[PDB]
Amino acid sequence: TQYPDARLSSPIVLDQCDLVTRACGLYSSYSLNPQLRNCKLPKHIYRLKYDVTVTKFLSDVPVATLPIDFIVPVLLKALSGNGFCPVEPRCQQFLDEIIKYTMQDALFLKYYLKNVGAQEDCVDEHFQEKILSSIQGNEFLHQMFFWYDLAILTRRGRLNRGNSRSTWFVHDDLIDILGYGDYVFWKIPISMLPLNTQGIPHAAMDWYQASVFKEAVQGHTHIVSVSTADVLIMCKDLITCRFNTTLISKIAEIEDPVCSDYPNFKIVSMLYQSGDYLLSILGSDGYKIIKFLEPLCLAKIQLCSKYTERKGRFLTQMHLAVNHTLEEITEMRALKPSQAQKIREFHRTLIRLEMTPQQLCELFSIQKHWGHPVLHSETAIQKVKKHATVLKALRPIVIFETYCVFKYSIAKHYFDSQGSWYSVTSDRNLTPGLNSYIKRNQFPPLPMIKELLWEFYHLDHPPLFSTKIISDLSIFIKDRATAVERTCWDAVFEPNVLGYNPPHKFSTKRVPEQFLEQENFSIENVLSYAQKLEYLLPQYRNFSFSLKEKELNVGRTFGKLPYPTRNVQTLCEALLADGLAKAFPSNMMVVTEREQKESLLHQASWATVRGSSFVTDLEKYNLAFRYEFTAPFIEYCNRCYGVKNVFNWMHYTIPQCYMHVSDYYNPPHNLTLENRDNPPEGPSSYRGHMGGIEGLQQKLWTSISCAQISLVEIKTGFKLRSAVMGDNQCITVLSVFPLETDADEQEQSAEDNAARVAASLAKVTSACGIFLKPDETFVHSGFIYFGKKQYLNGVQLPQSLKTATRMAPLSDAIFDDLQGTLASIGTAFERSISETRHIFPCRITAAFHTFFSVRILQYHHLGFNKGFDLGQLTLGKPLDFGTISLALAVPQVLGGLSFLNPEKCFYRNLGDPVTSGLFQLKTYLRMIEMDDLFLPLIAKNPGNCTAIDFVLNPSGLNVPGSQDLTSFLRQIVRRTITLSAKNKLINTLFHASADFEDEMVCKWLLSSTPVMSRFAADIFSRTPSGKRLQILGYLEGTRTLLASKIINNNTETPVLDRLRKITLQRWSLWFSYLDHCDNILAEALTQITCTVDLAQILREYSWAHILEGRPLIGATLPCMIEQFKVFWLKPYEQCPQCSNAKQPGGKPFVSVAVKKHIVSAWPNASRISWTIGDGIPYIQPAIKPKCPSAALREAIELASRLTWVTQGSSNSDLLIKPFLEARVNLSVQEILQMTPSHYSGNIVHRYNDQYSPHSFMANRMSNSATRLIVSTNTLGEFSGARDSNIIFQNVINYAVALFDIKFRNTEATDIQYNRAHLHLTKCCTREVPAQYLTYTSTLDLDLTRYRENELIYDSNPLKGGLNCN
Amino acid sequence: MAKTISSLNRVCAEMVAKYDLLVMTTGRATATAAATEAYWAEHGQPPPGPSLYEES
Amino acid sequence: DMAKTISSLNRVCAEMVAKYDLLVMTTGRATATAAATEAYWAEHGQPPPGPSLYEESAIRGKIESRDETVPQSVREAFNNLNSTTSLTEENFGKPDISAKDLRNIMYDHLPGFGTAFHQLVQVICKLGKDSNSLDIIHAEFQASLAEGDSPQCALIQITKRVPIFQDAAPPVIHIRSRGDIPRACQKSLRPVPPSPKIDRGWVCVFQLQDGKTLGLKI
Amino acid sequence: DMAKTISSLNRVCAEMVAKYDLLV
Amino acid sequence: PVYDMAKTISSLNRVCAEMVAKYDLLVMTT
Ligand SMILES: [Zn+2]
């Protein structure tokens, strides 16, 4: 019961390899732990000495080996595809047709664009040829295929690690890669290791004293280097990332010869070689230089604006840092002088290279292409120990002022939302100034806070937030690991390396089995665990780090706590996010150049307004928090939530734990059965942790951070905007200037104000305990680079490669589903298009990997046995290019594998997947001249799906191909819940008749005479059946499904066999379309022009058996590409559509025009994507409860929806009654009084703009949207008192994105068009009548069962009080 | 007694002034001291089990 | 009539109570007293196990004065805390650029190894360090790089514009033989004329122990 | 109307003095 | 009730003097 992951997902920890070498007779010293030298060998790998294949492999190798840190760069160059590998068919054979597909897909893309109107004017006559050359001459092509063969072999090897099939042998030109279960031996020539002055390879310096390495390696020419299969996996990930990056750069040069936004592939290749050379000389330490790629790219970007003294100070500090690091790690390592000059080529290129800002921002996202250092447990505990045990000096006056501003910001947030002060129960004498404002019931302005600041300390008030606000119970089941309890803490280390057997076993360390095993689980019971300080009980004083993976820094760790303390943490995070943390909104994204001048000036009122920021690292705050600092804030959070000791838990628990790393093969040093109860401190473990842990109480710490930022704002007096994302916190200082000032002078002064704010904030936080290192924080005037999107003076820079290089034929899909893998590639392709101005590079990379996934799962599927041609057990005859290419052209919602929809280049969220998919399929078939193959591909045999599926996936069709494994997984979780879930509030939730109830609820929500799937889904989200579907949907890993202690215990057919059946059926569906076809539907669908009709009659025929003839409305929207046709215009010309129409003919259209102004351009105004204009980006309850619970809020929402939808019928209340009876103890009339349900309008249209889950974002960079004006007033009647299927927000996204696409490479001054009309195609749009739902019956189920279930119910919804108006 | 009022005003003003010139060093027992305090208040016994990190 | 006097007393007293109540809340029940703190300093190296309160000047003293009472951790803590007092808007973000770091920074821009420009650089960093004008030099270099110039142009302009290089003569470098200069340095060198300058004249002059002297040129 | 005010001060200072009392 | 004001002011001065006395015992003087 196991499944090796396809991609690297675990930290590269090589301590286990140290035992392997000892069994084989070799020698290695990966682990810093002396225990692994002389511990008893695990019986699993003790048998290597009995192996014949391993002995014959290492017979001609010295006892010495070398760390794989230094050999990884050698393998990345020495290894090629020219040798013999025991994999058939080789991945290299596929190449010849993968390219044939890639080119064909590129061709489709071009064809699509040709009919949408977004084709580049300049046509590269050899475009296909260039693609073919680029793909062939890529220098990591053959290496990538070879590394996929090695990954295939090592996956098979891991799956059957105990069987005889584990060993595999590969002989390249000069490298021998014999491999065991999850240990890979590499045999490499000594000659190709760089030497040191002493005459031994740089790898040997760490482990062997010279004259002992050369005596061990005496006559031998080859040496071995034992490494875990994870290193083979990450080298495969490196090589495929390098391949994507060089292919992407080359195809960009093909589509944009003048200046492509990606870094030139030659420079990137040189960077790769420099980095590998550096790694081959230094080791894992070399990453302490590779790590400076991103900061040096950010420096080099910033210097691309007007040069201000503090602009170069970023690059100077980074350059100094790089030199100091390079000297420190090479001081004690004897490098020959040649090597000293050449190890520096990496950062020397990073400094010299001159590139446009966009190129640098793409290069920024290659930082992980050199690898990830081999983490040690020891080097990752020293880091936290030095920052979490250090004593800190705090100025109370600053802690006092930060706390008062904390209260001030919570009072201010309460005032704005609730509209008045909270009931001040404290003495009015203690607040002489504040009580006057409270009496007038108005909040004091920001200038006068300075004198009244201390008064805030004395404000008191009753609880200001509810203790029951969690709605997604999945947080308590969300899959993860938790520390085992203290009595069995050492159960995580394996007994042979541990050296004694752990006296107490542990039941499980998994959170889902723990959640199901907890009988008395409830939110008030989590609180009673907290308030009663149960987390200080002996069994729960445990804590255990775990090295984070894919990190270039020497090991960075994330904490794990015992399951009950973990529930307390999740509750505190949920409580803060829904309540208090909303008082310090740190998501406020500020880009000053785009925002309107007036709103900006009134925003900085505390003329012109200028904003300059400085970005600090909030990640290092966590270790520096101290309880002397955090006590007031924590006490206040408790008093603000009406609890005691809840938000307090970390500083009471962590300081009293035995911090260590739960590393399977590296226990804390000197650990024995004698001192298991009182472990000794050592380099691996340390006792007192007076501090924070990363992630834990992220919501509280960010709140104290925004409190310090507001304290600096009060003191200094500038308008501060605080925004945090990931690890960095960017504080934008807005300073107001008089209008009659020099623009060059005001920028300088604004940057100076930012540096003054930074100095004050340094003083503040220094007093609070958090040292803001002034060297590594920089004052950026105009470069906003925190967060998802980087801006340079408001021109959005592209970071495409961070998602485009993650594409791969193998991904972590459920089982090894092709659809899951293809979907991942489709998602990476949508995102990468979004965040760059180049279409074809990422299209080529996603096509390449789509076909390569198909083939690689076709032969080498990991679930099926070796040599199991999945193409043969389904099709009987072998899958050819033809069948795959046609199964990749049928979009997934019709049932197929096409997840690369060209339309997603125009906009992200799609109005209707069926209509868009149909339009795509139609255009493809028109290209390849197989129109007649249309209807048959569409019309399939509808599957057998219940109404539950329809409600869970409204927009879809009832086609078995159009189905992801989620249903199957949810059925397995359901089975494991009904079988061995002892949780009380889950058994009550998942009672015996669960399935019957979900079916009844679903048939009902769809029993309305006009059926509206989306409304069904919306209510269902609030009904208890939606809560069951949320709890069930927690399984998304293949290893968890296939290896859980609570999943595989079922007495039915084993999971693996069911999975094989499902795989083979799915393959049958996808790749045999003639078989699974329905002729009736094919006759129904004949001779129908427009996609919307096809989609509606196909959608009604699929769900025929659930609809039973009742019409389905609110589920088909036109495919905007066919709805609107584009007519570009040269200046001083009118479009033919507007001329043919006398008055009414083709009149209605969306007008787009260019703006001549250019607010900002970097590097110049050559490309539309480089410049931004000034344009805008895009275009009641009677009694409101003061602290509504999640259940009450969902109840009100549910009631509001039901009333609004069923407004026509007079029995609305009789429809609402059952649902509210499972959720609140209110009469329907009471809730109706609490409902804001006073508005009315067209149900369908107002359901799509504001009630649809998708926000309809654009998939194209915002730089071109500001350069355009998009007027929808010329649509005539269809312009906004009218209702239509037109989705206005996507018409704007489509108009902008289309204009961007057509001119993404052309020079701006050469654009021969200034105006665009998106005219309405008559056939494919029509006015949607306003209707209303009319239920003719009521849900007869007695949902009152959930009265006891506090996850579902809400016993006393009016506890926190009520307010007027 | 206006003399007592002025005297108390002056003593308080001096204390507030001397507050801005304070510096404290975070200790190794603050978390444990607040834990003993929160456990004695809530349950009336000392925190159970092995000693906490820095007990008095 | 004490209404005004009692109102002022209320303002100051309420402020004092607020501040000192937060101080109580932060420093828990195990706060070490002044006497207890310094006893613990005395009989043990480390600080006492619990927050201790000091006046700024109290520990400013006995840290500026050589004394064994303050633990190393307390001295380090206080130095860190007072390090941020010096920070202003001018001081924040300015790197400390030494002669060696300036040489390494300027090398990396120069192509090749051992060129005449490398010798120019290690001369410039020598005149700069003596004249305490490194910051001006580097500012000049960076500005030259930014303004569309190669590192060779940056060095020659950094020798023109920086005032320490107004008329200073090239330094003499003793070498045992003419082969000590690198091969890349062999290209451009000529016998030294009388009274040279560093750029209007010649980069630098290597006087050999056997009389010979050859000067470099850009 | 001073009584409350001054009484209110005794309602706080004393209490916080009691706090410092536990420390010493 | 002016005698009440004298008594409570005496009490308030007493407790502020006590707090000053406790301060100098916590905080190091010089
Ligand atoms: Zn028109």
Swiss-Prot record, chain A:
Essential cofactor(s): Mg(2+)
The keyword DNA-binding is assigned to this record: no
Oligomeric form and interacting partners: Forms homooligomers. Interacts with VP35; this complex constitutes a functional polymerase complex.
Subcellular location field: Virion; Host cytoplasm
Stretch list, region Homooligomerization: 1-445
Transmembrane segments: none
EC number annotated for this UniProt entry: 2.7.7.48, 3.6.1.-, 2.7.7.88, 2.1.1.375
Keywords, in A-Z order: ATP-binding, Host cytoplasm, Hydrolase, Methyltransferase, mRNA capping, mRNA processing, Multifunctional enzyme, Nucleotide-binding, Nucleotidyltransferase, RNA-directed RNA polymerase, S-adenosyl-L-methionine, Transferase, Viral RNA replication, Virion
Swiss-Prot/TrEMBL GO biological process terms: negative stranded viral RNA replication; negative stranded viral RNA transcription
Any one GO cellular component localisation term in the record: host cell cytoplasm
Source organism superkingdom: Viruses
Substrates-to-products reaction catalysed: RNA(n) + a ribonucleoside 5'-triphosphate = RNA(n+1) + diphosphate; a 5'-end (5'-triphosphoguanosine)-adenylyl-adenylyl-cytidylyl-adenosine in mRNA + 2 S-adenosyl-L-methionine = a 5'-end (N(7)-methyl 5'-triphosphoguanosine)-(2'-O-methyladenylyl)-adenylyl-cytidylyl-adenosine in mRNA + 2 S-adenosyl-L-homocysteine + H(+); a 5'-end (5'-triphosphoguanosine)-adenylyl-adenylyl-cytidylyl-adenosine in mRNA + S-adenosyl-L-methionine = a 5'-end (5'-triphosphoguanosine)-(2'-O-methyladenylyl)-adenylyl-cytidylyl-adenosine in mRNA + S-adenosyl-L-homocysteine + H(+); a 5'-end triphospho-adenylyl-adenylyl-cytidylyl-adenosine in mRNA + GDP + H(+) = a 5'-end (5'-triphosphoguanosine)-adenylyl-adenylyl-cytidylyl-adenosine in mRNA + diphosphate
Motif (Essential for both viral transcription and replication): 726-729
Region (Interaction with VP35): 1-375
Domain RdRp catalytic per the UniProt entry, residue ranges: 610-794
Main location: virion
A molecular function (GO) term: RNA polymerase activity
Shown part of the complete sequence: 6 to 1393 of 2212
Protein known as: RNA-directed RNA polymerase L
Swiss-Prot record, chain B:
Localisation: Virion; Host cytoplasm
Modification comment: Phosphorylated by host IKBKE. Phosphorylation contributes to efficient viral replication and transcription.
Oligomeric form and interacting partners: Homodimer. Homooligomer; via the coiled coil domain. Interacts with nucleoprotein NP and polymerase L; VP35 bridges L and NP and allows the formation of the polymerase complex. Also interacts with VP30; this interaction is regulated by VP30 phosphorylation. Interacts with host IKBKE and TBK1; the interactions lead to inhibition of cellular antiviral response by blocking necessary interactions of IKBKE and TBK1 with their substrate IRF3.
Family recorded in the similarity comment: Belongs to the filoviridae polymerase cofactor VP35 family.
Role noted for this protein: Plays an essential role in viral RNA synthesis and also a role in suppressing innate immune signaling. Acts as a polymerase cofactor in the RNA polymerase transcription and replication complexes. Serves as nucleoprotein/NP monomer chaperone prior to the formation of the large oligomeric RNA-bound complexes. Regulates RNA synthesis by modulating NP-RNA interactions and interacting with DYNLL1. VP35-NP interaction controls the switch between RNA-bound NP and free NP and thus the switch between genome replication and genome packaging into the nucleocapsid.
UniProt free text on domains: The interferon inhibitory domain (IID) binds dsRNA.
Name used for this protein in its record: Polymerase cofactor VP35
Native source species: Zaire ebolavirus (strain Mayinga-76)
Curated annotation (Swiss-Prot), chain D:
Modifications made to the protein after synthesis: Phosphorylated by host IKBKE. Phosphorylation contributes to efficient viral replication and transcription.
Top-level taxonomic group: Viruses
Subcellular location: Virion; Host cytoplasm
Domain free text: The interferon inhibitory domain (IID) binds dsRNA.
Quaternary organization: Homodimer. Homooligomer; via the coiled coil domain. Interacts with nucleoprotein NP and polymerase L; VP35 bridges L and NP and allows the formation of the polymerase complex. Also interacts with VP30; this interaction is regulated by VP30 phosphorylation. Interacts with host IKBKE and TBK1; the interactions lead to inhibition of cellular antiviral response by blocking necessary interactions of IKBKE and TBK1 with their substrate IRF3.
Family as reported in the entry's similarity comment: Belongs to the filoviridae polymerase cofactor VP35 family.
Function, as annotated: Plays an essential role in viral RNA synthesis and also a role in suppressing innate immune signaling. Acts as a polymerase cofactor in the RNA polymerase transcription and replication complexes. Serves as nucleoprotein/NP monomer chaperone prior to the formation of the large oligomeric RNA-bound complexes. Regulates RNA synthesis by modulating NP-RNA interactions and interacting with DYNLL1. VP35-NP interaction controls the switch between RNA-bound NP and free NP and thus the switch between genome replication and genome packaging into the nucleocapsid.
Protein name (Swiss-Prot/TrEMBL): Polymerase cofactor VP35
Organism this protein belongs to: Zaire ebolavirus (strain Mayinga-76) (ZEBOV)
Gene that this sequence comes from: VP35
Stretch of the intact protein here: 123 to 146 of 340
